[PDB]
PDB file of C-alpha atoms and ligand atoms in Angstrom:
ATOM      1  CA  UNK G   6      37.587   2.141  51.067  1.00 14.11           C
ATOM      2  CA  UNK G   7      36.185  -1.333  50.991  1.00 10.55           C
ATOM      3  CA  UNK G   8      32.707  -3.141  49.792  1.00  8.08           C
ATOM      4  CA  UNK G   9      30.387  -5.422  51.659  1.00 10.95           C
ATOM      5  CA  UNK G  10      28.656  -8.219  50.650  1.00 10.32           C
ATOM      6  CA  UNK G  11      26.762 -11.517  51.723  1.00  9.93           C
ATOM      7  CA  UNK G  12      27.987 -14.943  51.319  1.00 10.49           C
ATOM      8  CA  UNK G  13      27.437 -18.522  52.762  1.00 11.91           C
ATOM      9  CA  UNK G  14      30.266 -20.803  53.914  1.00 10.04           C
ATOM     10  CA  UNK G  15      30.454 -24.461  54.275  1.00 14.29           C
ATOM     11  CA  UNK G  16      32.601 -26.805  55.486  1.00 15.69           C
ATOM     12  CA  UNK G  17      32.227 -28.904  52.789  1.00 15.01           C
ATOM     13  CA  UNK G  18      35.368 -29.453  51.784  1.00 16.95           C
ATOM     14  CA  UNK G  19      37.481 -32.419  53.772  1.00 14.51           C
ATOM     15  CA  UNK G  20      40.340 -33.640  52.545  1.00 17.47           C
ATOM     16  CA  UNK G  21      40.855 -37.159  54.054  1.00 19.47           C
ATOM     17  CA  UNK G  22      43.994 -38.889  54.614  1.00 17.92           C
ATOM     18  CA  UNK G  23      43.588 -42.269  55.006  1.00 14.48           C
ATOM     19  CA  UNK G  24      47.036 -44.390  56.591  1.00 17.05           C
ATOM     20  CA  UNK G  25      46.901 -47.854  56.643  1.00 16.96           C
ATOM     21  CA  UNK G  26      48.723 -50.391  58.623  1.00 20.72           C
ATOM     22  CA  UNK G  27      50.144 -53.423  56.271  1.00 21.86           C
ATOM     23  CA  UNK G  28      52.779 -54.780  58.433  1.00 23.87           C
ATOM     24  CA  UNK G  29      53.252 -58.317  59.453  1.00 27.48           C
ATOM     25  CA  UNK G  30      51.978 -57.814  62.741  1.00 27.20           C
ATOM     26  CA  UNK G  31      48.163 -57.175  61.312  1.00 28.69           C
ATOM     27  CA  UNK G  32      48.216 -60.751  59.425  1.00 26.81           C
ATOM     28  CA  UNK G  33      46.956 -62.138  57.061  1.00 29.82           C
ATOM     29  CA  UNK G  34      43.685 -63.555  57.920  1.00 29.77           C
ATOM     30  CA  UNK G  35      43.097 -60.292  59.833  1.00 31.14           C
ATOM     31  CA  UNK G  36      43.548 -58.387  56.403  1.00 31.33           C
ATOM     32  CA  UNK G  37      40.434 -60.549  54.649  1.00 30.13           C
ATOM     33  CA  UNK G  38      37.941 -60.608  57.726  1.00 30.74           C
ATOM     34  CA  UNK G  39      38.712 -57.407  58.974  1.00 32.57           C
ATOM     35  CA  UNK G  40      40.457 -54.969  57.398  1.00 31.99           C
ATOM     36  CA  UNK G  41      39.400 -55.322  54.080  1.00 29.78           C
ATOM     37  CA  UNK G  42      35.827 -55.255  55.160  1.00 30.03           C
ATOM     38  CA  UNK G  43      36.197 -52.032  57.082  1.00 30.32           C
ATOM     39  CA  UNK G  44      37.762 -49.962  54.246  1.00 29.77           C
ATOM     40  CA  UNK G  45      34.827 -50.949  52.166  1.00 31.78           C
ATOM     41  CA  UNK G  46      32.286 -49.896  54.134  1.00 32.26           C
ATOM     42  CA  UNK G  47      34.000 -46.938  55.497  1.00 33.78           C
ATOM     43  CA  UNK G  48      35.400 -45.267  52.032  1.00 30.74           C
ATOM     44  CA  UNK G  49      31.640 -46.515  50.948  1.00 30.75           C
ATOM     45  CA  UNK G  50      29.980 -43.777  53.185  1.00 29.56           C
ATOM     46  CA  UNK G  51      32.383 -41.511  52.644  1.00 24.14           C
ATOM     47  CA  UNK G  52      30.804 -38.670  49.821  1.00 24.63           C
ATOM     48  CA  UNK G  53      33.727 -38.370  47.750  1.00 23.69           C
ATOM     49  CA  UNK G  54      33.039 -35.336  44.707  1.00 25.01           C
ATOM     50  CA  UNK G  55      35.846 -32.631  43.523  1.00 22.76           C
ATOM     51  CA  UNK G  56      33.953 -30.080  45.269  1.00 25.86           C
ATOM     52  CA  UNK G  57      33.836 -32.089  48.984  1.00 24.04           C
ATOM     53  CA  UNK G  58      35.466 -34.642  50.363  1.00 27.17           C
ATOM     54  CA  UNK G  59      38.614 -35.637  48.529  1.00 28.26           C
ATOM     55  CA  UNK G  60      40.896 -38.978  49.587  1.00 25.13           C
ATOM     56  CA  UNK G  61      44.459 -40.003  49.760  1.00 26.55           C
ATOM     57  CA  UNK G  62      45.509 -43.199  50.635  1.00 27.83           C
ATOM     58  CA  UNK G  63      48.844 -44.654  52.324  1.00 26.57           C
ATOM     59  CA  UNK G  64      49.978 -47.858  52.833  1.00 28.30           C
ATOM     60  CA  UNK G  65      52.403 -48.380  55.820  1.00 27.87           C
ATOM     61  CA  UNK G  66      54.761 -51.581  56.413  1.00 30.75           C
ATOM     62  CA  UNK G  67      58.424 -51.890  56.087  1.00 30.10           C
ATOM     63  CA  UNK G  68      58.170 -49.426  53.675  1.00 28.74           C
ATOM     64  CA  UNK G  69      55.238 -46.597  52.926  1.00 28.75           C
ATOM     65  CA  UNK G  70      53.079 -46.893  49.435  1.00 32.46           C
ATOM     66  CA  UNK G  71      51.265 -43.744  48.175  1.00 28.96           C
ATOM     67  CA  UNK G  72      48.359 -45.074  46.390  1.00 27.25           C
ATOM     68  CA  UNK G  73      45.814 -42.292  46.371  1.00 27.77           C
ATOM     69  CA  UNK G  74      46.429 -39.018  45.628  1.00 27.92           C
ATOM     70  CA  UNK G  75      44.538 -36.045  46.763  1.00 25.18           C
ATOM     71  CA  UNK G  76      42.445 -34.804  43.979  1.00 21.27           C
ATOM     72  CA  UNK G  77      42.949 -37.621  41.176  1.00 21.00           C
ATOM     73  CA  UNK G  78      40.467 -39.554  39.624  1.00 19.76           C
ATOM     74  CA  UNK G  79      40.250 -42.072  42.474  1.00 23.28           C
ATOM     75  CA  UNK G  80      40.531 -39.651  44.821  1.00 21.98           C
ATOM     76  CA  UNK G  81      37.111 -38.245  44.422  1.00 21.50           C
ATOM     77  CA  UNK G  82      35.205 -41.157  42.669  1.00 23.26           C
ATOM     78  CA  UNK G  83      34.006 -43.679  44.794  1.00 24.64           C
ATOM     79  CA  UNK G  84      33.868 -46.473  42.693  1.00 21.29           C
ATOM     80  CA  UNK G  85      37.778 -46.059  42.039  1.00 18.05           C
ATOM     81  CA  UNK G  86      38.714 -45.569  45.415  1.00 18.42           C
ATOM     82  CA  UNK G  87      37.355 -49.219  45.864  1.00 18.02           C
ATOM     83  CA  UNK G  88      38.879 -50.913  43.237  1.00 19.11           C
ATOM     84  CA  UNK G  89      41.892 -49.972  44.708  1.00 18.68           C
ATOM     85  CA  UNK G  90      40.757 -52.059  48.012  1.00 18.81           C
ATOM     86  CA  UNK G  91      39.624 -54.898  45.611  1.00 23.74           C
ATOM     87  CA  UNK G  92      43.329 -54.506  44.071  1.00 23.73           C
ATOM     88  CA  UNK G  93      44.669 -54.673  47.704  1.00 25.65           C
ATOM     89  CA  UNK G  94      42.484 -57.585  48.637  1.00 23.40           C
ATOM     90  CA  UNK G  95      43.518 -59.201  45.577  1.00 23.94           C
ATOM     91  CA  UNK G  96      47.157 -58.590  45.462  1.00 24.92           C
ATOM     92  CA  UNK G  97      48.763 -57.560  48.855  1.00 27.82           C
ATOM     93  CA  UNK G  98      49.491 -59.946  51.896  1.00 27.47           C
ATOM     94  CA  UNK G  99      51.093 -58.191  55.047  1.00 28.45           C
ATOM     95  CA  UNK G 100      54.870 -58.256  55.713  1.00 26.76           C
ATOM     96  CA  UNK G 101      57.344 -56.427  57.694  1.00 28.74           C
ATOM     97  CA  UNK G 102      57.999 -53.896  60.160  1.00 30.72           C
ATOM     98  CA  UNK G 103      55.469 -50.512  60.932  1.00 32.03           C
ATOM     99  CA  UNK G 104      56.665 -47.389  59.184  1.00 30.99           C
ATOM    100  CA  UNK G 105      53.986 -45.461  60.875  1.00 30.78           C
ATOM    101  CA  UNK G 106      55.777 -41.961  61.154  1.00 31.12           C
ATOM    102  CA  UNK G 107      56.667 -42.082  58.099  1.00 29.38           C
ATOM    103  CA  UNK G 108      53.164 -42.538  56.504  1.00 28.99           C
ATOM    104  CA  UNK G 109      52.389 -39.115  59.503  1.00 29.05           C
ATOM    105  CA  UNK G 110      54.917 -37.755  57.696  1.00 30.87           C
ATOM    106  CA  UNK G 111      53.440 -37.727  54.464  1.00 23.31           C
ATOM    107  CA  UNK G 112      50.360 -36.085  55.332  1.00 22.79           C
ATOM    108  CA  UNK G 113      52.967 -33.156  57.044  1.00 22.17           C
ATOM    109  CA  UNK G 114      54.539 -32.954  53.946  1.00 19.72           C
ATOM    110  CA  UNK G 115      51.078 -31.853  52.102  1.00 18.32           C
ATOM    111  CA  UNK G 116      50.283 -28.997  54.714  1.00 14.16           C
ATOM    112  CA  UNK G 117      54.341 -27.912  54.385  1.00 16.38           C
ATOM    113  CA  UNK G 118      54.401 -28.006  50.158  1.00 18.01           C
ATOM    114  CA  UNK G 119      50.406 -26.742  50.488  1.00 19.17           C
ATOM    115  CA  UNK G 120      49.267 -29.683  48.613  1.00 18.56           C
ATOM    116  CA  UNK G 121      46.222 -29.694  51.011  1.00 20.57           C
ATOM    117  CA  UNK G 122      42.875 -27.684  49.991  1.00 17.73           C
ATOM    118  CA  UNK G 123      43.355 -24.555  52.019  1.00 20.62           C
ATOM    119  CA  UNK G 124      39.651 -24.424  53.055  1.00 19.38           C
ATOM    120  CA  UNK G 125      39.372 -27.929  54.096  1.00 18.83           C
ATOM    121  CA  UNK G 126      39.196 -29.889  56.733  1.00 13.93           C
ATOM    122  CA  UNK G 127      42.418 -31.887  57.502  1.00 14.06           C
ATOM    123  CA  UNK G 128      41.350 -35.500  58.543  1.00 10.92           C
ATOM    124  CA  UNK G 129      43.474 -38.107  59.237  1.00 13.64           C
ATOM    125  CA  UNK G 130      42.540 -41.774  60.101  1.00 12.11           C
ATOM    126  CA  UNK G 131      45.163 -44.206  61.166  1.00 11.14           C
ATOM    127  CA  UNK G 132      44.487 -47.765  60.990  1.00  6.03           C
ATOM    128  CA  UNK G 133      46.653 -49.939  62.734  1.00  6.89           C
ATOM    129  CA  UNK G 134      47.230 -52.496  65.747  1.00  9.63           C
ATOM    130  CA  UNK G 135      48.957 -49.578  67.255  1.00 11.14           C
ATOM    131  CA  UNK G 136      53.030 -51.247  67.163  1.00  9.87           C
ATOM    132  CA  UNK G 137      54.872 -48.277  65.100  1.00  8.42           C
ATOM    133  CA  UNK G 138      58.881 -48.696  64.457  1.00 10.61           C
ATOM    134  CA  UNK G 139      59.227 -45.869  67.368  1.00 13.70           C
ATOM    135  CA  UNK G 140      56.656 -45.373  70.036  1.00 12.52           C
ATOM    136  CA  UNK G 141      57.968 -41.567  70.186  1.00 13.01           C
ATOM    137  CA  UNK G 142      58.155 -40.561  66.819  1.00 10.98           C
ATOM    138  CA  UNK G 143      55.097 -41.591  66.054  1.00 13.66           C
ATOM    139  CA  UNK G 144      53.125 -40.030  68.668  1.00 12.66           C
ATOM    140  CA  UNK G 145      55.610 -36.754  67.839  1.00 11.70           C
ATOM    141  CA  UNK G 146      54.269 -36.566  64.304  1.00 13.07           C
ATOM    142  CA  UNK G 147      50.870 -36.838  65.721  1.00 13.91           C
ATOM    143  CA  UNK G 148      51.214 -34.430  68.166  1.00 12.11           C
ATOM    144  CA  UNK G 149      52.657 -31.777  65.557  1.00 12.32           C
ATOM    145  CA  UNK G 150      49.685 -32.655  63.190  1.00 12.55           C
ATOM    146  CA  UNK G 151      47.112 -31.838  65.912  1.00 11.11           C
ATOM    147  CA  UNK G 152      49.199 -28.596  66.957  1.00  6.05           C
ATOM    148  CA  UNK G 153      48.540 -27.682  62.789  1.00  4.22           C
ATOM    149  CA  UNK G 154      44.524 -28.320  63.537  1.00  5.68           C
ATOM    150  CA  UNK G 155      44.470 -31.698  61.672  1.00  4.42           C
ATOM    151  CA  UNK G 156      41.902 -34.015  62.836  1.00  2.00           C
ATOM    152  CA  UNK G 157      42.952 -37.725  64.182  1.00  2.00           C
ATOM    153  CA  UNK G 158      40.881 -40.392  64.301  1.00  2.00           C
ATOM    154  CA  UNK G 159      42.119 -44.126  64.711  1.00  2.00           C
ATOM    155  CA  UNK G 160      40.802 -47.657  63.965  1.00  2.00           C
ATOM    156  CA  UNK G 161      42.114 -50.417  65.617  1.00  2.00           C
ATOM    157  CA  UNK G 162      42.730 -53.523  63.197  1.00  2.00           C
ATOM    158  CA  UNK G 163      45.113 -56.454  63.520  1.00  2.00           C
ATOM    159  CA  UNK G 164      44.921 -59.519  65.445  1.00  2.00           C
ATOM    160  CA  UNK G 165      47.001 -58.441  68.467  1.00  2.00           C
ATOM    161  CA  UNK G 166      45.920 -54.638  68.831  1.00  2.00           C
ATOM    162  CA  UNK G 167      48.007 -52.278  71.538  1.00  2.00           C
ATOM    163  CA  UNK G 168      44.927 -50.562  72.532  1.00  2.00           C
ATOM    164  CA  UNK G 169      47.365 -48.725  74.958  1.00  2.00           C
ATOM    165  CA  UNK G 170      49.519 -47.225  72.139  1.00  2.00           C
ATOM    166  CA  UNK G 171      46.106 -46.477  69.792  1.00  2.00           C
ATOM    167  CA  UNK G 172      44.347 -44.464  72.698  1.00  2.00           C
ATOM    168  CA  UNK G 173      47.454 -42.189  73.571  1.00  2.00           C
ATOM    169  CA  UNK G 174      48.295 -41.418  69.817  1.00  2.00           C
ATOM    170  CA  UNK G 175      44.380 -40.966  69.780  1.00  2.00           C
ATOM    171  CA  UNK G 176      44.612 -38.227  72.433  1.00  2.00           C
ATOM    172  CA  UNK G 177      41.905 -40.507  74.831  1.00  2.48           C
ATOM    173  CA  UNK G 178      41.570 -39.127  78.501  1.00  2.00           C
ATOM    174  CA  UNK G 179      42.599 -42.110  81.199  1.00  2.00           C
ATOM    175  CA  UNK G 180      39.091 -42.663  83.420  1.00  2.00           C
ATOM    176  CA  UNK G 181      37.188 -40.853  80.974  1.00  2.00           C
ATOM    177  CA  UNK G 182      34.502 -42.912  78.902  1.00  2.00           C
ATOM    178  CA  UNK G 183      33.145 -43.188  75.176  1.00  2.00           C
ATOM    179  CA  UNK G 184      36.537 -41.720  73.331  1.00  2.00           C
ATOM    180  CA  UNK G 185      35.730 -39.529  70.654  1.00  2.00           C
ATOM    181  CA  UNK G 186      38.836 -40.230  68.658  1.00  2.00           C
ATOM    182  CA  UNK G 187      38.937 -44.371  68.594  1.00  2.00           C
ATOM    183  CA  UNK G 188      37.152 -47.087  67.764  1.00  2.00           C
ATOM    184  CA  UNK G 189      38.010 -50.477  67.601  1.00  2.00           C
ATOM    185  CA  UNK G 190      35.001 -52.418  66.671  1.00  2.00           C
ATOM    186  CA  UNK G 191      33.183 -52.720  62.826  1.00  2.00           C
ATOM    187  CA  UNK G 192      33.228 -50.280  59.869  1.00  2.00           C
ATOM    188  CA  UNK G 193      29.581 -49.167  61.675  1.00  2.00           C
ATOM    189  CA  UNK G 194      31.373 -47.867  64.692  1.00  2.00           C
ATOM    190  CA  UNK G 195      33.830 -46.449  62.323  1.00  2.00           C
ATOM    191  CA  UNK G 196      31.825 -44.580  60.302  1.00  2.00           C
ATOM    192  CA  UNK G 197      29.665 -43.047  62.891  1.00  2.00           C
ATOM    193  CA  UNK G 198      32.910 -42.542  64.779  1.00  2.00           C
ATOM    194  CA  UNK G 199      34.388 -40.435  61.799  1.00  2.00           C
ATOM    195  CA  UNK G 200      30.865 -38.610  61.463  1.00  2.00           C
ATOM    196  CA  UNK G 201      31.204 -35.554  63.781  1.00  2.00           C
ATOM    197  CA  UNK G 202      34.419 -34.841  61.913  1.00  2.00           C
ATOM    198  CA  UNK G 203      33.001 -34.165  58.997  1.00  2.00           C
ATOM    199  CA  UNK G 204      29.760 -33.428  59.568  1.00  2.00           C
ATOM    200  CA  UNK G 205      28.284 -30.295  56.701  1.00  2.00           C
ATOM    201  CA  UNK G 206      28.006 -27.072  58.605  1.00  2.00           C
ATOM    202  CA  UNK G 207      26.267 -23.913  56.661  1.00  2.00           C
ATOM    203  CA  UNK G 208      26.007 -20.264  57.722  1.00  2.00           C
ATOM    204  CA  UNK G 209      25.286 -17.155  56.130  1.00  2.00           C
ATOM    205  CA  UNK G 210      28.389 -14.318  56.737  1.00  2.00           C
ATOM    206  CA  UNK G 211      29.209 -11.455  55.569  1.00  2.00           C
ATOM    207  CA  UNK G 212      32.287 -10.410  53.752  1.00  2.00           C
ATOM    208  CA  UNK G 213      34.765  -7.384  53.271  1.00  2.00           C
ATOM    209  CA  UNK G 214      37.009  -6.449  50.594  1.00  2.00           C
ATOM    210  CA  UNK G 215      39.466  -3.356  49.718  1.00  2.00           C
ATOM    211  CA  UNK G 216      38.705  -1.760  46.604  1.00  2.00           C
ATOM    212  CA  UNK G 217      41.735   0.445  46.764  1.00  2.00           C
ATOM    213  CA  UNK G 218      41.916   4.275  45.865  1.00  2.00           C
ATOM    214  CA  UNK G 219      40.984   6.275  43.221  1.00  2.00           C
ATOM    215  CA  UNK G 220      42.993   7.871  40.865  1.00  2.00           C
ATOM    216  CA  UNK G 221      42.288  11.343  40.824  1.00  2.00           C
ATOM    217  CA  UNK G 222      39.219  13.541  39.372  1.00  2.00           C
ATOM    218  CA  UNK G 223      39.033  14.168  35.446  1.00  2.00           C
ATOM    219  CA  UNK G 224      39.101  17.762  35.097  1.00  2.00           C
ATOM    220  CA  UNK G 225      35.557  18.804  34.449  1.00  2.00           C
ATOM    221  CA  UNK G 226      33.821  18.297  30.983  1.00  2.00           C
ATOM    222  CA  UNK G 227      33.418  22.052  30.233  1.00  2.00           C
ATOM    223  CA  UNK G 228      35.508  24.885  30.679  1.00  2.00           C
ATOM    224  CA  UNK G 229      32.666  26.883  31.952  1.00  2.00           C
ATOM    225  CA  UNK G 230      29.075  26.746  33.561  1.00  2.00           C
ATOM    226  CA  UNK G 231      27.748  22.787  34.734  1.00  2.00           C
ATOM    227  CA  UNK G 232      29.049  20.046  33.170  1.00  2.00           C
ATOM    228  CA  UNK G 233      30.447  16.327  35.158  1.00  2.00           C
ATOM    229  CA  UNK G 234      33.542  14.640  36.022  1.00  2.00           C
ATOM    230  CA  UNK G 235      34.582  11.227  36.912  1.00  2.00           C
ATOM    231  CA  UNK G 236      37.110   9.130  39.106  1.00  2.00           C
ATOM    232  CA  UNK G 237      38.770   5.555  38.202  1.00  2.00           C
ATOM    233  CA  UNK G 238      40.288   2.924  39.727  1.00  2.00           C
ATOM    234  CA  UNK G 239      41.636  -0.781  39.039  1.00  2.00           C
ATOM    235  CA  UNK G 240      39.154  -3.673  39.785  1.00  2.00           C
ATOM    236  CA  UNK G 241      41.359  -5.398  43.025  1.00  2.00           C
ATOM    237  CA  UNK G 242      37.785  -7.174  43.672  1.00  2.00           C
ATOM    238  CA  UNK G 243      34.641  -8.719  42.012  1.00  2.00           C
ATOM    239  CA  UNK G 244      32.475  -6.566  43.460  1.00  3.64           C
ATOM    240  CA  UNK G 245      33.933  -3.538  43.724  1.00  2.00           C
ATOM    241  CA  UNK G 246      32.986  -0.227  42.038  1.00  2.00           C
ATOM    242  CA  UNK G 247      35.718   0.816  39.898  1.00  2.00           C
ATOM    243  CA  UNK G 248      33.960   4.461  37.847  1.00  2.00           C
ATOM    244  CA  UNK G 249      32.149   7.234  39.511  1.00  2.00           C
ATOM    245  CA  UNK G 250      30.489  10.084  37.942  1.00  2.00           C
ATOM    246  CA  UNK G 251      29.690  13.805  39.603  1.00  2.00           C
ATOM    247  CA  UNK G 252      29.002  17.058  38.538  1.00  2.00           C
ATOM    248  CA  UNK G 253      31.190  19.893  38.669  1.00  2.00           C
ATOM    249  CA  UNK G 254      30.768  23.413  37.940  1.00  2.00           C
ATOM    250  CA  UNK G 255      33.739  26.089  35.883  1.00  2.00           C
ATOM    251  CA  UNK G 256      32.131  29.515  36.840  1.00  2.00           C
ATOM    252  CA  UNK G 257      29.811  30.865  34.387  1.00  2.00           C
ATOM    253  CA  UNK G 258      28.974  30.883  30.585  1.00  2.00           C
ATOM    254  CA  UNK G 259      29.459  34.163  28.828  1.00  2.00           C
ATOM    255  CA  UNK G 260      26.299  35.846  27.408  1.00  2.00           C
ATOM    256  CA  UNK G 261      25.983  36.026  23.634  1.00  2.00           C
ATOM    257  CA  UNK G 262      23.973  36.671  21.007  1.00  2.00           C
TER     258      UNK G 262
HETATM  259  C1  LIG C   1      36.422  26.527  27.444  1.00  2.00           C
HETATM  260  O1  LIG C   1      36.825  27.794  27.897  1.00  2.00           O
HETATM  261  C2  LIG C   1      35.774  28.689  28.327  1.00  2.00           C
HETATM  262  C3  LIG C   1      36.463  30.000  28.707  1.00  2.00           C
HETATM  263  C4  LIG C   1      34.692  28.877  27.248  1.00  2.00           C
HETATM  264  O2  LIG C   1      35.174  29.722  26.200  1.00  2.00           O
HETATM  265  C5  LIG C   1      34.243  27.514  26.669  1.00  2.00           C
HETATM  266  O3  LIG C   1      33.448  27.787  25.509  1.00  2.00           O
HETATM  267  C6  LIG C   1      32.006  27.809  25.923  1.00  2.00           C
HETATM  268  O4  LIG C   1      31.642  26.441  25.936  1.00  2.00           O
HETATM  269  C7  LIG C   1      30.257  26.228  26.114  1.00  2.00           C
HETATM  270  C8  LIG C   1      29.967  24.730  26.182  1.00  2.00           C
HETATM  271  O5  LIG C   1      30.637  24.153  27.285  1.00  2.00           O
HETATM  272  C9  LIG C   1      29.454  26.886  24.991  1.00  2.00           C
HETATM  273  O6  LIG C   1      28.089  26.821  25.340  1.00  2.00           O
HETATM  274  C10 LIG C   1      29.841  28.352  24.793  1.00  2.00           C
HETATM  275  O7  LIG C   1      29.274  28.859  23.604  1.00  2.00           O
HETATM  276  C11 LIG C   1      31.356  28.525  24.747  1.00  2.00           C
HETATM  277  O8  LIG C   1      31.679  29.898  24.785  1.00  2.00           O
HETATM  278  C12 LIG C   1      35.449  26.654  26.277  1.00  2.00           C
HETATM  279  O9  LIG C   1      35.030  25.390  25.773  1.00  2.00           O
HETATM  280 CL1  LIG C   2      57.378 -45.496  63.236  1.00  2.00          CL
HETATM  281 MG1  LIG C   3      53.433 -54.143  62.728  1.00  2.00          MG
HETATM  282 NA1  LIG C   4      52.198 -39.537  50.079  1.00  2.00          NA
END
């Protein structure tokens, strides 16, 4: 048989993959004014804890650069998850060419190895000026993300942005307004952009479990008249009943005396 039992669920947990675009076509200048601002005040509203949201962090350009990892230390501490923007601010000036399905690649590679939280929300956002390696392979990877329920959302930095290319990878509608899924202004826009993705939902549900069968009835305690008898069975759940006591009756007692 099984057992019931009551138990809230929240979407709490969000594990966030953040991609960004370091190629030489984003710049230089554009990386102080622009893109280093937005990651700060984006990963600065972002609630990062063990229990909720936790980050990773790619850097894309002629070649890819993990620098976050879900679930370390400056994964789900705030204040280390921007000192590795100060470090990039500090230390990294754009070059190359736009590994971009790569980077989408890495964040496939955590759902197929089942690095990912398996209660979490999958979030990607993609920063870039939208000019990957290959147009095709990067909106492929995208597409098979989505088809895996992974959430895309993309920011538009660089100082020549394909808004063309950003939209379509997005998933935006042609003639329809106010695109859920890019945003190409400040870290503001970004933020409340990246809001309804990850926005705390609570609800009370209740849950089922198998608790598997009994092994069979003890014989009874007595060999005649009343006496009890009992049933056992491995715990496969928490809250399931694993001993059970009855009575049971062997005919009755002689008469003496
Ligand atoms: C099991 O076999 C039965 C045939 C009886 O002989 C049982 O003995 C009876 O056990 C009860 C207690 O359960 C005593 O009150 C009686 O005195 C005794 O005859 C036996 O255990
Ligand atoms: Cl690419
Ligand atoms: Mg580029
Ligand atoms: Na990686």
């Amino acid at each position: 048989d099984e057992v019931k039992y009551s138990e809230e669920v929240c979407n709490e947990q969000v594990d966030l993959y953040l991609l960004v675009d370091g190629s030489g076509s984003i710049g230089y200048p554009n990386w102080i004014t622009k893109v280093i601002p937005m990651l700060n005040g984006l990963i600065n509203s972002l609630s990062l804890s063990r229990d909720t949201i936790n980050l990773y962090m790619n850097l894309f350009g002629s070649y890819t650069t993990e620098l976050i990892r879900l679930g370390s230390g400056q994964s789900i501490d705030k204040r280390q998850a921007l000192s590795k923007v100060t470090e990039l601010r500090k230390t990294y000036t754009p070059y190359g060419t736009t590994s971009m399905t790569a980077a989408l690649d890495e964040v496939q590679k955590h759902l197929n190895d089942r690095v990912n939280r398996e209660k979490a929300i999958q979030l990607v956002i993609l920063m870039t000026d939208g000019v990957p390696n290959s147009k095709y392979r990067a909106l492929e990877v995208a597409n098979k993300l989505k088809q895996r329920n992974v959430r895309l959302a993309v920011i538009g930095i660089g100082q020549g942005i394909n808004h063309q290319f950003n939209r379509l990878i997005a998933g935006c509608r042609p003639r329809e307004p106010n695109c859920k899924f890019y945003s190409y202004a400040d870290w503001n826009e970004a933020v409340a952009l990246i809001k309804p993705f990850i926005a705390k939902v609570c609800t009370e549900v209740e849950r089922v479990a198998n608790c598997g069968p009994w092994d069979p009835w003890t014989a009874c305690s007595v060999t005649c008249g009343r006496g009890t008898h009992s049933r056992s069975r491995p715990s496969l759940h928490e809250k399931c009943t694993t001993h059970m006591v009855s009575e049971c009756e062997e005919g009755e007692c002689p008469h003496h005396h």
